[PDB]
Amino acid sequence: GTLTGERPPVFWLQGQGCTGCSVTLLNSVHPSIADVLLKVISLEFHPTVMAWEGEHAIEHMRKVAEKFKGKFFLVIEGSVPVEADGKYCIIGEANHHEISMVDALKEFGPNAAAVLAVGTCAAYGGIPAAEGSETGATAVSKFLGDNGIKTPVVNIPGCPPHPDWIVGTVVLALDAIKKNGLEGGLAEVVKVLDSDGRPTPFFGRNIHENCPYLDKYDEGVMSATFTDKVGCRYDLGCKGPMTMADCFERKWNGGVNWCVQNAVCIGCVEPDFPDGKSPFYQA
Amino acid sequence: ATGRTTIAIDPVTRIEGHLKAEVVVENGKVVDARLSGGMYRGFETILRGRDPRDASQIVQRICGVCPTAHSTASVLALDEAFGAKVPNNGRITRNLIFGANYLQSHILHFYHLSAQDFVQGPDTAPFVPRFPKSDLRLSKELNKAGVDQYIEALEVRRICHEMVALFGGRMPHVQGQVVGGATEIPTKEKLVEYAARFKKVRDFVEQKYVPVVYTIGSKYKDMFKVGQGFKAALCVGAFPLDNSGKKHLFMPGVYAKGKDMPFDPSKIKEYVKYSWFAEETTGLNYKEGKTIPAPDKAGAYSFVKAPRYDGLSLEVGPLARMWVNNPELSPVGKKLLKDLFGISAKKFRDLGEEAAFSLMGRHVARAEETYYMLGAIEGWLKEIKAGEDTVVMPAVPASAEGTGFTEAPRGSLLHYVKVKDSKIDNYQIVSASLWNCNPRDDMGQRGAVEEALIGIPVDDIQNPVNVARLIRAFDPXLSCAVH
Ligand code: SF4
Ligand code: SF4
Ligand code: FCO
Ligand SMILES: [Cl-]
Ligand SMILES: [Fe+2]
Ligand code: NI
Ligand SMILES: [S]
């Protein structure tokens, strides 16, 4: 990239998120987050990092959204709670009116080029939608569909996603758009999504079938304590067999570790996370 | 003289999570304040019915900035409930995992959240647009140093997360802390890798971060004269230094009305009159806590409960810990206090109560604490034994209870778990930004930040920058506060 290159506008809205999807992005190695922000995208609204605040920040987003109607990318971090008329997630106030996440997604969703549902909460509901919850936490694609909003959605799940899945999906989309324009490019992106909306370059391969401990699994050699790194982790709860992600190769945090080496996979990229992957520490 | 202007700020940005602040300004000063935590998930009900061991994964998703704190409080609560005896080497490994995130979080807070309060960034989003009169006082050179350090700090904080992940598996949301200890024995090779990263972080902290906070502070000396609030603080203890449970890097204590007092956790109660929870649940200690949302309840204004300590409204965080524990100041702090402020100081309390409990004092405390944590991590790197086991594998109890106490980067954190029929029967969280960013209690006494806003200057109601500057000095995390 270059400081003077074309950089599309991005709004990043937090619903029922934990800010971990933002933090994981800050950990991008190549390109670094400084390069992403200064050379790849124009992050026009993001409550955790932006300079302005309050109604002025909301109005700035609205002005950019009007100027770039149909052309901005909308990132959602967290689920969208529909109970109690949206009151379980208020994202701002302007013109003496509170703005719920429900309101915000109905406002900006129809006018985005694409919605990037970043993290398992946004993609599939995640922990806020799990058993024992009562807020009506809803996945982005379902919320948009229920409200007749047709904007394309790309899911980039994980709890959190790896930074490379987020940045890499942005790069893949921007490349497709450079080659084919916005509509043709998004069509090419949609063609490489699996049935759960996930890009196949990152989510097209199963952890277990590519796991370094697969020989031990097949031999029935299972670790009985977490600190035994020779055996397979299946009896300790590893959900690798049911999980589609490239962690076995990409690893985490600059390649220093990953979940299976360190402990177990908890299936964090899967639509049934957490309840369908729990208990975490039993098969 | 001027009359009243009421100012609402939603979202407060450059914090974590969903916050509205509303202040009443009269004659150029804040005279009243209300803080509203705006997003609820309900972890305390989601957790019920689960295998208790799942909690040390689920609870981290309260917050992806401080997940190691929740991991730590959860595994400590589970250790107690299960009767798990963490091996000595696992205690040290846990300290290395969690300590590295203190470095990450304080660096993130000062540079990536707070520094734009004082520094003009590059002329592109997300650094513009901003208030036309932002009160940015630094010279061209010092401002550029701030921007250059912001950019370098993006790499430094990422390296801190590599340190966390070396023994924690990944970050955000570690895999490596469980009931019974830590899941991965440190090897000689990985300890070399941790130490090499730590040296780079140490050099940035010592040469750039601590000096820049004092230097910027010396251009904003007025910010040591506001933000005192109640001048009351809480520390519950953190980072065990042996296996007795009695010795910790930060020792517990309460400070209020000019007096040090012991910490007795039975004196914590959570009030809800001004919070969106059922009125029948007001005034409960966490061991009997209940979480029944009431989003339509008249008069309430926040999803944060109102914790009080024997009726006192207290603050938490680096200032609280450094004030309660009163460690020696860093060498560069002692030097710059003398050179830039004319202050002769040896220990943290030598700043004096008024300057410590101030907007800029909280930034200074956080930088000083980052330096203090370097020495603790260095000690743990000398104490750890490569190859020695770090975990035990305890059976799940049918009936049990436990409480885990620690200090998250933003302040005191406890998790309480009750197990019945081998499943979670209750799980209650009392977190750092709960102590700081809560609403009024049932008697109408303000929360700590609400009270610290009183007296904040607003000489220009069109550019009321000091309101959020004060809030950011406390490093709020509303996702932690509400859970
Ligand atoms: S169960 Fe887990 S550790 Fe075992 S081979 Fe499969 S992915 Fe690897
Ligand atoms: S190894 Fe499993 S739990 Fe870890 S990040 Fe990959 S998919 Fe998520
Ligand atoms: N640090 C942190 Fe998170 C908060 N507030 C906790 O506890
Ligand atoms: Cl933490
Ligand atoms: Fe709580
Ligand atoms: Ni937090
Ligand atoms: S946090």
Coordinates of N, CA and C in Angstrom, one line a residue, chain B residues 199-355:
Chain B
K199 N 12.5 -8.1 26.9 CA 13.5 -7.0 26.8 C 13.1 -5.9 26.0
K200 N 12.5 -6.2 24.8 CA 12.0 -5.1 23.9 C 10.9 -4.3 24.6
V201 N 10.0 -5.0 25.3 CA 9.0 -4.2 26.0 C 9.5 -3.4 27.1
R202 N 10.5 -3.9 27.9 CA 11.1 -3.2 28.9 C 11.8 -1.9 28.4
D203 N 12.5 -2.0 27.3 CA 13.2 -0.9 26.8 C 12.2 0.2 26.3
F204 N 11.1 -0.2 25.7 CA 10.1 0.8 25.3 C 9.5 1.5 26.6
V205 N 9.1 0.7 27.6 CA 8.5 1.2 28.8 C 9.5 2.2 29.5
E206 N 10.7 1.8 29.6 CA 11.7 2.7 30.4 C 12.1 3.9 29.6
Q207 N 12.3 3.8 28.3 CA 12.8 4.9 27.5 C 11.8 5.8 26.8
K208 N 10.6 5.3 26.6 CA 9.6 6.0 25.9 C 8.4 6.3 26.7
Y209 N 7.7 5.2 27.2 CA 6.4 5.4 27.8 C 6.4 6.1 29.1
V210 N 7.2 5.7 30.1 CA 7.2 6.4 31.4 C 7.7 7.9 31.2
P211 N 8.7 8.1 30.5 CA 9.1 9.5 30.3 C 8.1 10.4 29.6
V212 N 7.4 9.8 28.6 CA 6.4 10.6 27.8 C 5.2 11.0 28.7
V213 N 4.8 10.2 29.7 CA 3.7 10.5 30.5 C 4.0 11.7 31.4
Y214 N 5.2 11.7 32.0 CA 5.6 12.8 32.9 C 5.8 14.0 32.0
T215 N 6.3 13.9 30.8 CA 6.6 15.0 30.0 C 5.3 15.7 29.5
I216 N 4.4 14.9 29.0 CA 3.1 15.4 28.6 C 2.4 16.0 29.8
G217 N 2.4 15.3 31.0 CA 1.8 15.8 32.2 C 2.4 17.2 32.6
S218 N 3.7 17.4 32.3 CA 4.3 18.7 32.7 C 3.7 19.9 31.8
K219 N 3.1 19.6 30.7 CA 2.4 20.6 29.9 C 1.0 20.7 30.2
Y220 N 0.4 19.8 31.1 CA -0.9 19.8 31.5 C -1.0 19.7 33.0
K221 N -0.2 20.6 33.7 CA -0.2 20.6 35.2 C -1.5 20.9 35.8
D222 N -2.4 21.6 35.1 CA -3.7 21.9 35.6 C -4.5 20.6 35.8
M223 N -4.1 19.5 35.1 CA -4.9 18.2 35.2 C -4.5 17.4 36.4
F224 N -3.6 17.9 37.2 CA -3.3 17.3 38.5 C -4.2 17.9 39.6
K225 N -5.0 19.0 39.2 CA -5.7 19.8 40.2 C -7.2 19.5 40.1
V226 N -7.7 18.5 39.3 CA -9.1 18.2 39.1 C -9.2 16.6 39.1
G227 N -10.4 16.2 39.3 CA -10.7 14.7 39.2 C -10.5 13.9 40.5
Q228 N -10.5 14.6 41.6 CA -10.2 13.9 42.9 C -11.4 13.0 43.3
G229 N -12.6 13.4 43.1 CA -13.7 12.6 43.5 C -13.7 12.3 45.0
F230 N -14.0 11.1 45.4 CA -14.1 10.7 46.8 C -12.7 10.5 47.4
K231 N -11.6 10.4 46.6 CA -10.3 10.1 47.1 C -10.3 8.8 47.9
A232 N -10.9 7.8 47.4 CA -11.2 6.6 48.1 C -10.9 5.4 47.1
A233 N -10.2 4.4 47.6 CA -9.7 3.4 46.8 C -9.8 2.0 47.4
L234 N -9.7 1.0 46.5 CA -9.8 -0.4 46.9 C -8.8 -1.3 46.1
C235 N -8.1 -2.2 46.9 CA -7.3 -3.2 46.3 C -7.6 -4.5 47.0
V236 N -7.8 -5.6 46.2 CA -8.1 -6.9 46.8 C -7.0 -7.9 46.7
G237 N -5.8 -7.5 46.2 CA -4.6 -8.4 46.1 C -4.5 -9.1 44.8
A238 N -3.3 -9.3 44.4 CA -3.1 -10.0 43.1 C -1.6 -10.4 43.0
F239 N -1.4 -11.5 42.1 CA -0.2 -12.1 41.8 C 0.5 -12.7 43.0
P240 N 0.1 -14.0 43.3 CA 0.6 -14.6 44.5 C 2.1 -14.9 44.3
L241 N 2.9 -14.6 45.4 CA 4.3 -14.7 45.3 C 4.8 -16.0 46.0
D242 N 4.0 -16.7 46.6 CA 4.3 -18.1 47.1 C 2.9 -18.8 47.2
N243 N 3.0 -20.0 47.8 CA 1.8 -20.9 47.7 C 0.9 -20.8 49.0
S244 N 1.2 -19.9 49.8 CA 0.5 -19.7 51.1 C -0.9 -19.0 50.9
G245 N -1.1 -18.3 49.8 CA -2.3 -17.5 49.7 C -2.2 -16.2 50.5
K246 N -1.1 -15.9 51.2 CA -1.0 -14.7 52.0 C -0.1 -13.6 51.5
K247 N 0.7 -13.9 50.5 CA 1.7 -12.9 50.0 C 1.5 -12.7 48.5
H248 N 1.4 -11.4 48.2 CA 1.0 -11.0 46.8 C 1.8 -9.8 46.4
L249 N 2.0 -9.7 45.1 CA 2.7 -8.5 44.5 C 2.0 -7.2 45.0
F250 N 0.7 -7.2 44.8 CA -0.2 -6.1 45.3 C -0.9 -6.7 46.5
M251 N -0.8 -6.1 47.7 CA -1.5 -6.5 48.8 C -2.8 -5.8 49.0
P252 N -3.8 -6.4 49.6 CA -5.1 -5.8 49.7 C -5.1 -4.7 50.7
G253 N -6.1 -3.8 50.5 CA -6.4 -2.7 51.4 C -7.4 -1.8 50.9
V254 N -8.0 -1.0 51.8 CA -9.0 0.0 51.5 C -8.5 1.4 52.0
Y255 N -8.7 2.4 51.2 CA -8.3 3.8 51.6 C -9.5 4.7 51.4
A256 N -9.9 5.4 52.5 CA -11.1 6.3 52.4 C -11.0 7.3 53.5
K257 N -11.5 8.5 53.2 CA -11.5 9.6 54.2 C -10.2 9.7 54.9
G258 N -9.1 9.6 54.1 CA -7.8 9.9 54.6 C -7.1 8.7 55.4
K259 N -7.8 7.6 55.4 CA -7.3 6.5 56.3 C -7.2 5.1 55.6
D260 N -6.1 4.4 55.9 CA -6.0 3.0 55.4 C -6.8 2.1 56.4
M261 N -7.4 1.1 55.8 CA -8.2 0.1 56.5 C -8.1 -1.2 55.8
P262 N -8.3 -2.3 56.6 CA -8.3 -3.6 55.9 C -9.4 -3.9 55.0
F263 N -9.2 -4.8 54.1 CA -10.2 -5.3 53.2 C -10.9 -6.5 53.7
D264 N -12.2 -6.5 53.9 CA -13.1 -7.6 54.3 C -14.1 -7.8 53.2
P265 N -14.0 -8.8 52.4 CA -15.0 -8.9 51.2 C -16.4 -9.1 51.6
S266 N -16.7 -9.5 52.9 CA -18.1 -9.6 53.3 C -18.8 -8.2 53.3
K267 N -18.1 -7.1 53.3 CA -18.7 -5.8 53.3 C -19.1 -5.3 51.9
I268 N -18.8 -6.0 50.9 CA -19.3 -5.7 49.5 C -20.8 -6.0 49.4
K269 N -21.5 -5.0 48.9 CA -22.9 -5.2 48.5 C -23.1 -4.5 47.2
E270 N -24.0 -5.1 46.3 CA -24.3 -4.5 45.0 C -25.8 -4.0 45.1
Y271 N -25.9 -2.7 44.9 CA -27.2 -2.0 44.8 C -27.7 -1.8 43.4
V272 N -29.0 -1.7 43.3 CA -29.6 -1.6 41.9 C -30.7 -0.6 41.7
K273 N -30.9 0.3 42.7 CA -32.0 1.3 42.5 C -31.9 2.0 41.1
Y274 N -30.7 2.4 40.8 CA -30.5 3.2 39.5 C -29.9 2.3 38.4
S275 N -30.1 1.0 38.5 CA -29.6 0.0 37.6 C -30.8 -0.8 37.0
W276 N -30.7 -1.2 35.8 CA -31.8 -1.9 35.1 C -31.8 -3.4 35.6
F277 N -32.1 -3.6 36.8 CA -32.3 -4.9 37.4 C -33.5 -4.9 38.4
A278 N -34.1 -6.0 38.6 CA -35.3 -6.1 39.5 C -35.0 -5.6 40.9
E279 N -36.0 -4.8 41.4 CA -35.7 -4.1 42.6 C -35.5 -5.0 43.8
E280 N -36.1 -6.2 43.7 CA -36.0 -7.2 44.8 C -34.5 -7.7 45.0
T281 N -33.7 -7.4 44.0 CA -32.3 -7.9 44.1 C -31.3 -6.9 44.7
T282 N -31.8 -5.8 45.2 CA -30.9 -4.8 45.7 C -30.2 -5.2 46.9
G283 N -28.9 -4.8 47.1 CA -28.2 -4.9 48.4 C -27.6 -6.2 48.7
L284 N -27.3 -7.0 47.7 CA -26.8 -8.4 47.9 C -25.3 -8.4 47.9
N285 N -24.7 -9.1 48.8 CA -23.3 -9.6 48.7 C -23.2 -10.6 47.6
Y286 N -22.0 -10.6 46.9 CA -21.9 -11.5 45.7 C -22.1 -12.9 46.0
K287 N -21.9 -13.4 47.2 CA -22.2 -14.8 47.5 C -23.6 -15.2 47.4
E288 N -24.5 -14.2 47.5 CA -26.0 -14.4 47.3 C -26.5 -13.5 46.1
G289 N -25.6 -13.2 45.2 CA -25.9 -12.3 44.1 C -26.9 -12.9 43.2
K290 N -27.7 -12.0 42.6 CA -28.8 -12.3 41.6 C -28.7 -11.3 40.5
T291 N -29.0 -11.8 39.3 CA -28.9 -11.0 38.1 C -30.2 -11.2 37.3
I292 N -31.2 -10.2 37.5 CA -32.5 -10.3 36.9 C -32.7 -9.0 36.2
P293 N -32.5 -9.0 34.8 CA -32.6 -7.7 34.1 C -34.0 -7.1 34.1
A294 N -34.0 -5.8 34.2 CA -35.2 -5.0 34.2 C -35.0 -3.7 33.4
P295 N -35.0 -3.9 32.0 CA -34.6 -2.8 31.2 C -35.6 -1.7 31.1
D296 N -36.8 -1.9 31.5 CA -37.8 -0.8 31.5 C -38.0 -0.2 32.9
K297 N -37.2 -0.5 33.9 CA -37.5 0.0 35.3 C -37.3 1.5 35.3
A298 N -38.3 2.2 35.8 CA -38.3 3.6 35.9 C -37.2 4.1 36.8
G299 N -36.5 5.2 36.4 CA -35.5 5.8 37.2 C -34.1 5.3 37.1
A300 N -34.0 4.0 36.6 CA -32.7 3.5 36.4 C -32.0 4.0 35.1
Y301 N -30.7 4.0 35.1 CA -30.0 4.6 34.0 C -28.7 3.8 33.5
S302 N -28.6 2.6 34.0 CA -27.3 1.9 33.6 C -27.5 0.4 33.8
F303 N -26.8 -0.5 33.0 CA -26.7 -1.9 33.2 C -25.6 -2.3 34.2
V304 N -24.9 -1.3 34.7 CA -23.9 -1.5 35.8 C -24.6 -1.5 37.1
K305 N -24.4 -2.5 37.9 CA -24.8 -2.5 39.3 C -24.0 -1.5 40.1
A306 N -24.4 -1.1 41.3 CA -23.6 -0.2 42.1 C -23.0 -0.8 43.3
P307 N -21.7 -1.2 43.2 CA -21.1 -1.9 44.4 C -20.6 -0.9 45.4
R308 N -20.9 -1.2 46.7 CA -20.4 -0.4 47.7 C -19.7 -1.2 48.8
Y309 N -18.7 -0.6 49.4 CA -17.9 -1.3 50.4 C -18.2 -0.7 51.8
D310 N -19.0 -1.4 52.6 CA -19.4 -0.9 53.8 C -20.1 0.5 53.6
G311 N -20.8 0.7 52.6 CA -21.5 1.9 52.2 C -20.6 2.9 51.4
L312 N -19.3 2.6 51.3 CA -18.4 3.6 50.6 C -18.4 3.3 49.1
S313 N -18.3 4.4 48.4 CA -18.1 4.4 46.9 C -16.6 4.6 46.7
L314 N -15.9 3.5 46.2 CA -14.5 3.4 46.0 C -14.1 3.4 44.5
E315 N -12.9 3.8 44.2 CA -12.3 3.5 42.9 C -11.3 2.4 42.9
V316 N -10.9 1.9 41.8 CA -10.0 0.8 41.6 C -9.1 1.1 40.4
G317 N -7.9 0.4 40.3 CA -7.0 0.6 39.2 C -5.6 0.8 39.7
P318 N -4.8 1.2 38.7 CA -3.4 1.5 39.1 C -3.2 2.5 40.2
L319 N -3.9 3.6 40.2 CA -3.8 4.6 41.3 C -4.1 3.9 42.6
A320 N -5.3 3.2 42.6 CA -5.7 2.5 43.8 C -4.6 1.5 44.4
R321 N -4.0 0.7 43.5 CA -3.0 -0.3 43.9 C -1.8 0.4 44.4
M322 N -1.3 1.4 43.6 CA 0.0 2.1 43.9 C -0.2 2.9 45.2
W323 N -1.4 3.5 45.4 CA -1.6 4.3 46.6 C -1.6 3.3 47.8
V324 N -2.4 2.2 47.7 CA -2.5 1.3 48.8 C -1.2 0.7 49.2
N325 N -0.4 0.3 48.2 CA 0.8 -0.4 48.4 C 2.1 0.5 48.6
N326 N 2.0 1.7 48.1 CA 3.1 2.7 48.2 C 4.5 2.2 47.9
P327 N 4.7 1.7 46.7 CA 6.0 1.3 46.3 C 6.9 2.5 46.0
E328 N 8.2 2.2 45.9 CA 9.2 3.2 45.4 C 8.8 3.6 44.0
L329 N 9.0 4.8 43.7 CA 8.9 5.3 42.3 C 10.0 4.9 41.4
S330 N 9.8 4.8 40.1 CA 10.8 4.5 39.1 C 11.9 5.5 39.2
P331 N 13.1 5.1 38.8 CA 14.2 6.1 38.7 C 13.8 7.3 37.8
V332 N 13.2 7.1 36.6 CA 12.9 8.2 35.7 C 11.8 9.0 36.3
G333 N 10.8 8.4 37.0 CA 9.8 9.2 37.7 C 10.4 10.1 38.7
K334 N 11.3 9.6 39.6 CA 11.9 10.5 40.6 C 12.6 11.6 39.9
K335 N 13.3 11.4 38.8 CA 14.1 12.4 38.1 C 13.2 13.4 37.5
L336 N 12.2 13.0 36.8 CA 11.3 14.0 36.0 C 10.4 14.7 37.0
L337 N 9.9 14.1 38.1 CA 9.2 14.8 39.1 C 10.0 16.0 39.6
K338 N 11.3 15.8 39.8 CA 12.2 16.9 40.3 C 12.4 17.9 39.1
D339 N 12.8 17.4 37.9 CA 13.2 18.3 36.9 C 12.1 19.1 36.3
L340 N 10.9 18.4 36.1 CA 9.8 19.1 35.4 C 8.7 19.6 36.3
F341 N 8.7 19.2 37.6 CA 7.6 19.6 38.5 C 8.2 20.2 39.8
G342 N 9.5 20.1 40.1 CA 10.0 20.6 41.3 C 9.5 19.8 42.5
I343 N 9.2 18.5 42.3 CA 8.7 17.7 43.4 C 9.9 16.7 43.7
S344 N 10.1 16.6 45.1 CA 11.1 15.6 45.6 C 10.2 14.5 46.1
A345 N 10.4 13.3 45.5 CA 9.6 12.1 45.8 C 10.4 10.9 45.7
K346 N 10.2 10.0 46.6 CA 10.8 8.6 46.6 C 9.8 7.5 46.5
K347 N 8.7 7.6 47.1 CA 7.6 6.6 47.1 C 6.4 7.2 46.5
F348 N 5.5 6.4 46.0 CA 4.3 6.9 45.3 C 3.5 7.9 46.1
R349 N 3.3 7.6 47.4 CA 2.5 8.6 48.2 C 3.1 10.0 48.3
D350 N 4.4 10.1 48.0 CA 5.1 11.4 48.1 C 4.5 12.4 47.1
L351 N 3.7 11.9 46.1 CA 3.0 12.8 45.2 C 2.0 13.6 46.0
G352 N 1.5 13.1 47.1 CA 0.4 13.7 47.9 C -0.9 13.2 47.4
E353 N -1.9 13.2 48.3 CA -3.2 12.6 48.0 C -3.9 13.4 46.8
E354 N -3.8 14.7 46.8 CA -4.5 15.5 45.8 C -4.0 15.3 44.4
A355 N -2.7 15.3 44.2 CA -2.1 15.1 42.9 C -2.2 13.6 42.5

